Amino acid sequence: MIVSFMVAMDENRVIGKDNNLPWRLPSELQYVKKTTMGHPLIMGRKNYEAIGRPLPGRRNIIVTRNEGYHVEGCEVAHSVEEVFELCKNEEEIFIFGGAQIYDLFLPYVDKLYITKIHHAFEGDTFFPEMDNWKEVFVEKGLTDEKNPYTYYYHVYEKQQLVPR
Numbered sequence: 635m636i637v638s639f640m641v642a643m644d645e646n647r648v649i650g651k652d653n654n655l656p657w658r659l660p661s662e663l664q665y666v667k668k669t670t671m672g673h674p675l676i677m678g679r680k681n682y683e684a685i686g687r688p689l690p691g692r693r694n695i696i697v698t699r700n701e702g703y704h705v706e707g708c709e710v711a712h713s714v715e716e717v718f719e720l721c722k723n724e725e726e727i728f729i730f731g732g733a734q735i736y737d738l739f740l741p742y743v744d745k746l747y748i749t750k751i752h753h754a755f756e757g758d759t760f761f762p763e764m765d766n767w768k769e770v771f772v773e774k775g776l777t778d779e780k781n782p783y784t785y786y787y788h789v790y791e792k793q794q795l796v797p798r
């Protein structure tokens with residue numbers, strides 16, 4: 635099962651503030667929605683609560699220590715093992731939100747769906763750093779009136795290597 639990340643980022647690798655996104659990008663969010671369509675959404679509790687509601691078209695799997703955490707139209711996992719368990723028959727998943735959720739799926743990550751907004755915002759949350767990788771795709775995001783920022787979509791798959 636392909637373990638993919640889906641993050642929208644910043645100049646300073648900002649991916650949030652008190653809980654929500656510092657930017658308002660309906661186009662970006664559409665590219666997000668389309669890309670992950672058909673695949674589960676792996677996201678932490680405070681993250682999903684930022685999102686606000688179950689994103690349709692995909693298994694909404696949530697992560698939390700809380701054994702007694704439930705939320706309608708959503709699956710909940712207390713372990714990475716329990717996510718891999720749930721998504722055992724999945725061809726690909728998308729790690730979505732919570733900087734600490736990334737660090738849990740870090741050891742397994744396969745593909746990186748990183749958006750980079752060319753600005754410096756004020757944010758509390760940030761994205762863990764990484765050493766590789768290998769960019770396979772790149773496209774600029776639509777800067778409109780409703781997308782008042784310049785940002786590009788960046789895809790990264792693991793860098794191979796020629797046997798010594």
Ligand SMILES: COc1cc(Cc2cnc(N)nc2N)cc(OC)c1OC
Pocket residue numbers: 640641642653654655663666681684685686689730731749
């Ligand atoms: C509904 O779509 C949302 C998705 C996300 C997570 C997320 C969304 N897109 C990308 N590219 N990376 C992410 N980590 C975060 C959100 O706010 C926290 C969303 O809306 C509220």
Ligand SMILES: [Ca+2]
Pocket residue numbers: 635637742743744
């Ligand atoms: Ca893997």
